[PDB]
Amino acid sequence: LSTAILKQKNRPNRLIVDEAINEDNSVVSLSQPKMDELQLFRGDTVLLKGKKRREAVCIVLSDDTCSDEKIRMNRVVRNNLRVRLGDVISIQPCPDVKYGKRIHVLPIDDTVEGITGNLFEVYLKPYFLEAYRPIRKGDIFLVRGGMRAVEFKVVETDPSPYCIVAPDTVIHCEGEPIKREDEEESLNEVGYDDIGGCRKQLAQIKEMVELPLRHPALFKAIGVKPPRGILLYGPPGTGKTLIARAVANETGAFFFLINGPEIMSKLAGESESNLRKAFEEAEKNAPAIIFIDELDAIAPKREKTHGEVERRIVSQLLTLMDGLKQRAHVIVMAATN
Amino acid sequence: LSTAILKQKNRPNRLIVDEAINEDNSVVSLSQPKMDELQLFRGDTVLLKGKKRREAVCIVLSDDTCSDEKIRMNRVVRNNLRVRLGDVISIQPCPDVKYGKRIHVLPIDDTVEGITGNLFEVYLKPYFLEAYRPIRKGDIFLVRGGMRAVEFKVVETDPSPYCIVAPDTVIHCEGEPIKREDEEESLNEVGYDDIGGCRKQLAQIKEMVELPLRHPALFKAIGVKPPRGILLYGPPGTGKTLIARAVANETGAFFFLINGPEIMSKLAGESESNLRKAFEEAEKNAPAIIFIDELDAIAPKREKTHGEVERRIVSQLLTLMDGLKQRAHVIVMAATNRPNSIDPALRRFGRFDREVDIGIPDATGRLEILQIHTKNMKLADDVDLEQVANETHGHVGADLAALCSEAALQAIRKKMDLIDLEDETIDAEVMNSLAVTMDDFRWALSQSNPSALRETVVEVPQVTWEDIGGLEDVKRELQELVQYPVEHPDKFLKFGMTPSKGVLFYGPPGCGKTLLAKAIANECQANFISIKGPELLTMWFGESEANVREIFDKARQAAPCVLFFDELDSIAKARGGNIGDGGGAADRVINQILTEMDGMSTKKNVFIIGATNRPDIIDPAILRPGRLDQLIYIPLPDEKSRVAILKANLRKSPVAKDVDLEFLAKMTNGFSGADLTEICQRACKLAIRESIESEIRRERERQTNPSAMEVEEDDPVPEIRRDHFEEAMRFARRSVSDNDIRKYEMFAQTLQQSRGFG
Amino acid sequence: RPNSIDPALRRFGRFDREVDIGIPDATGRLEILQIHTKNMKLADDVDLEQVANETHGHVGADLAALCSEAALQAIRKKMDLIDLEDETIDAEVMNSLAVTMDDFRWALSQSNPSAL
Amino acid sequence: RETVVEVPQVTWEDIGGLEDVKRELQELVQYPVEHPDKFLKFGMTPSKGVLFYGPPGCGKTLLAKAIANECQANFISIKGPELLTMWFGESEANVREIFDKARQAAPCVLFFDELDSIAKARGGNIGDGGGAADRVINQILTEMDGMSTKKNVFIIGATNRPDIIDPAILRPGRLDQLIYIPLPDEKSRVAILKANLRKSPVAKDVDLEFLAKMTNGFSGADLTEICQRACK
Amino acid sequence: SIAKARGGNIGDGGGAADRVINQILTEMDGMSTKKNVFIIGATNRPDIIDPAILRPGRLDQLIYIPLPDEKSRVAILKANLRKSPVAKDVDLEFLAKMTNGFSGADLTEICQRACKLAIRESIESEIRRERERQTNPSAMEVEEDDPVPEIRRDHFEEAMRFARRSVSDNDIRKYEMFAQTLQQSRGFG
Ligand SMILES: Nc1ncnc2c1ncn2[C@@H]1O[C@H](COP(=O)(O)OP(=O)(O)OP(O)(O)=S)[C@@H](O)[C@H]1O
Ligand SMILES: Nc1ncnc2c1ncn2[C@@H]1O[C@H](COP(=O)(O)OP(=O)(O)OP(O)(O)=S)[C@@H](O)[C@H]1O
Ligand SMILES: Nc1ncnc2c1ncn2[C@@H]1O[C@H](COP(=O)(O)OP(=O)(O)OP(O)(O)=S)[C@@H](O)[C@H]1O
Ligand SMILES: Nc1ncnc2c1ncn2[C@@H]1O[C@H](COP(=O)(O)OP(=O)(O)OP(O)(O)=S)[C@@H](O)[C@H]1O
Ligand SMILES: [Mg+2]
Ligand SMILES: [Mg+2]
Ligand SMILES: [Mg+2]
Ligand SMILES: [Mg+2]
């Protein structure tokens, strides 16, 4: 039970992906007892949750040749949810529908180059007019209203979770296109599937960091105070900054990063201000995490320290660590070798 | 009388709480001779005093079914006075009644949410109009003028001690409500009931700090100047900041706090201003206390200090300490965990001359710390805290806190198939089905790595005389050497004899020398410091002079104690050599031991005992009058001594009636106590082998016919029957040869002659 | 610390004379005790020459702390009447304070001196 | 240049002979892990130490790896050459770091090895001005005393020069269970030669019994030398 | 201790001259005679002594202090026994005629043993009195005096039984041979 927190806990609302034969980019395949199970009436908009906090919404259909344990979707949704073939995806009935005021799509330029022509009346007309197709802020969808695959990206939108775009919602095309590198660099984010060989330690870090921030009521009920500092250590090259970025992309808390050399490279009296601003922004915001990377660059032993300014930075860090109270909901974790 | 200041001193005006059946929140229950005793007329307002300086006032009633020794009140007064069921509360007749001008209540928002409605005409009307109900500034009272329990809090009021609210007193409801966390955090303040394992030191701190501030007239009358500096010290984690906050919440003096890193983290020239403002605000105000926490961060030794600004901060602190005069009524107390890295100019007379040593707790202390920390957890009935308190050996208070936390997290992990990290909230039955069992405390105790394992243990031992077999003449001699100068001082003054201080035990290995030295300390109820030559050849090469002075200073501080040196052959054979070498018969460590043993005053009751099993390479300079004098040779045991040893080792395990110990001692000839313990341990291991093999045969037989599984057997072996001792007798080998025994006889007769030549 | 002073200050014309205040002997310790106990109210049992013989490595401030610890022991024996909880103490209790030889034996048992 | 803390891969099957010590090492190591309460029925506290000593080449390292493979425990290995190096630069930290790492990775067998190099660089050949107690082995004894029994750290030693050994190592509460590992017998030599020859294919014309009846004082290292010569 | 931590037992690589005793000789040379500082030494191992200590203008006047004679032993036993009161039944002359190679430390050991035996009898007698008063506490009417004020005799006989000799006779003839000729150690050997 030492690694029991890493179990996926399969439930009736768990849906495994599979290949879908519909070229429409708003389809799901659910069976009739599944729609009668979660009270999903025909035409509902569910809230799909994938990996690395990416989400998606699609209008539901009753594809009765689907199985009760799976779901079928195309490559567009599986790239908007960052899943492979054979990964679970939660479903949530969220019919809280409000319309949008203005949406703002943006194309990707390398497919627009070649021939552009007119973007609006050739590309944005036949896909949006009388379709009611839902979007999330940050989706990449494909319209075959041109020469070949020219993709669009919804960036600026006033409804932030999602919205069903009515035909009266104002559609623009005046903005600036996006590069291919801008998406392909953001497809190289880090999750828990990029860490190998450290299962037993990821169990401990999820028990120490994720659980006292999602459920403070348990620790208050059973009478436990959660820890305030975690120190990762190891040899050089063993993946400590990687586990840092993995928790930074999962956890659903506010994340703030402090580097050792970046603090110590600044002028005297500006580095203490950066430490104070870090802890003030973390206590001001949500349940938070502060990651201090390379701790032994900003706080060595005081037999090695010769300056006055470096002893002042160590004493500043001690004073800021003692200010964390049980009310604050701030975890500080640091890494060293 | 060393802890006589911690006595509660029961008086006729002492009232023990009890449960009251009146739902009214202004009732007390007093008997008629109590009201005729303190001249309490019916309808008086008394001044009730509880814990942590909380007070309360209630109008008195004559409830004659109450007892003369108790009082009865509800939960409202017992939460306004911070007492439990079975705690004393002083009463004071204070009829000094003046009315209030404006009062200002404030609700608590979590009970107001749900439905609020109109607060004033529904909540504040029927409880205040024509009631004359008294309040203290800071009370939490309950009015049933709504949906459920909606509590109010009186914050702003012009009469500060208390007041009887007339109906003409202006009542407001416009203010801001208070959160639940704002009260529940302030219910976690610290008193003297949150400190466990430090009774003897709390006595000293109340004699030094509370008494010269409450009653300066006594110290001026008898002619005593009270001290100005107290230095608490100890290992990390032993509760020094906790004792600080406890005095900060009791004492009834002005309290000011200074942190080490908070002073040293500021810019140059701003830290000296914070020190000066601290002492100016303390001398400006009342009888005060200044607590300087982590003193060794702002004043280290000036060989370590490299700055100019840090030497200026140390000199500023010395100048401010010398400005304290007898007129001022200011006590300065400081806390550190590195008591030898403080600048030595601060530890002189007039600055930080008193020192109180908070130490590592023993088993009785660990039980009290565990009972304090688990008062909010929900323990199962299986949990025995005395077993846990015995099994935690090198722990300090913070380690026991981390032990309780790790146990409850294990209890969560066993309940993981219901709790989801993915969801929003947890079922209330899952939050109610949490109870920590003894299996959790065994997990948490298996995982914990404590902090104070590499410290020296100063305790009273647990070995009685009964664990030792044989050696009865040396029991009669050691009683006469140790116990009578403690118990009968004057009988050495009738004659002209000064008692001796040293004993040396020497002999063959395994003969039982350590247990006697522990047993005499258990007999006299003295402390016991144990040193080993391996432990003293390590941590000398790094600190070349301090180690043996630290041992003798710690033994002088913890008097009366027996200071037991042991394993002297390792010093003698790492420095003096096997067949002799270029090194001396005198050894550097044993040299500094002789120097420390000479300068030891006889008014102390520190008694020194040695032990070696290589008496030939011993230093001659150890043996001289005024040092280790009383040579006692401890020999191999005789056969009745061997029967007594075998009766001694066999008390924990159950054996049968078929065994004969007399024949078993008549088989062994040169066998020590270690060899007889080896035989008993071999026999127990053979019995455990047979038990496990029998259980394997039973489980395989149940696997053979699992259709019935109907044996329902009992325990196949509860004891050792016989004949394991025969195989153990076959295994045994002798430890000391006979040539060595005649050599020990020849050193047994004449070792005192080794002083001169040879 | 007479050997940590800069040696240029101890030359001719600057700090050439030196007077060595030292650790007192038994005749000195008796005089220090008779000075410090001139305001205390001693019982008739107290023999200061025995105390002056039994204090071996003490200097003057140690004898001051010895007298203070003795009088605090005399307070602790009178503790069942004195209340920390109250406001003031009865004048007969402040008049019934007199330090006996048992107190000086307690205080002398507890003291750890400086110049051993 | 790091210390490897893993579960080893040597099974019992790689070792030939020495079956009584297999039955003894199971009883010393495996039962206090597997059956805690059966030591609470009686009043016995289990021991913590084993010393193996004997002639060279007899097969002492493989047993210590094999018991760790049997119990599924970690395995830290130390050599006296490795501990006389990186002591002269860090005079006190090294042996504390080893025992702290073994306490952190519990349950593990902590295998000291090659004690003759410490004993012969400090204690000497025919004796000298140095002691029978050695500074490194002194700090080892200090670290071995202050070790709590709630942990399941088990200590195993090995030397092939048992005369210059420190007497202070051997005392109850330290390395107790002395086991002498002898030269192998002829059926033990047949088992050793069956053990070394499993990786390489050999024919049916070979006789191992005669080949063990030729060797008299030959250890396992010598029989492995013979097999390696044949493959070359 | 200086001679045996630096000069050694049977000799070693160290010298007969020792570093501390070297600096002592240097300080003893540069000492003006107008001062009245007088230096006295003591050792009980006269063989490994530095030869350089003994030279004119340094520690000159060698005095060998021997084992005491029997009238010297009577004087020693009169000296140790002045603090404690003893009786008139004791004979010190026979008690010195029993001891042969016994020093002053041994005679002080005998006297200390006798005082310890007397204190044992005193405490055991008080325990019997308190238990007898516990037996019949209804009266409690003895009002006894002091059962033992002095040492009577016969504790010295048990103390005589305990005693062991401190210096053997081989050592005494070795000290005689160093007593006659120690000044000749300056040259060779
Ligand atoms: N467990 C691992 N799984 C996958 N990739 C890893 C793992 N450990 C290291 N890597 C790779 O190693 C690269 C460097 O790892 P880092 O996280 O930079 O190491 P580090 O922990 O930061 O060590 P230092 O002290 O900062 S040099 C990462 O970018 C990964 O590509
Ligand atoms: N005697 C004790 N009784 C009850 N709780 C204790 C005791 N000693 C320590 N604790 C607990 O240990 C926690 C930490 O103790 P601290 O007071 O922080 O130790 P400390 O004395 O400050 O040591 P340092 O030098 O400051 S790290 C406290 O919050 C208590 O929970
Ligand atoms: N008289 C005795 N009664 C009971 N147990 C004894 C007795 N004598 C020895 N022992 C046992 O002998 C073992 C070692 O005891 P110790 O006194 O520590 O031995 P030692 O005299 O110190 O010699 P070493 O060098 O430690 S083996 C323990 O198991 C004791 O229980
Ligand atoms: N019983 C055995 N079974 C298999 N191989 C063995 C056996 N005994 C020894 N060997 C071989 O002997 C060689 C050395 O093994 P080790 O146990 O390391 O020797 P050792 O006892 O440590 O003595 P040294 O000092 O290292 S040569 C290896 O090649 C082993 O395969
Ligand atoms: Mg990194
Ligand atoms: Mg603290
Ligand atoms: Mg011992
Ligand atoms: Mg090997």
Author numbering:
A (entry chain F): 12 to 348
B (entry chain A): 12 to 769
C (entry chain B): 349 to 464
D (entry chain F): 465 to 696
E (entry chain B): 581 to 769
The authors write:
The conserved ATPase p97 (Cdc48 in yeast) and adaptors mediate diverse cellular processes through unfolding polyubiquitinated proteins and extracting them from macromolecular assemblies and membranes for disaggregation and degradation. p97/Cdc48 forms a ring-shaped homo-hexamer, with each protomer containing an N-terminal (N) domain, two tandem ATPase (D1 and D2) domains, and a C-terminal extension (CTE).
The pore loops of the D2 domain are relatively flexible and not well-resolved in p97 SH conformers I and II, which represent ATPase-inactivated states. Notably, R766 in the CTE no longer inserts into the ATP-binding pocket of the adjacent protomer as seen in the SH.
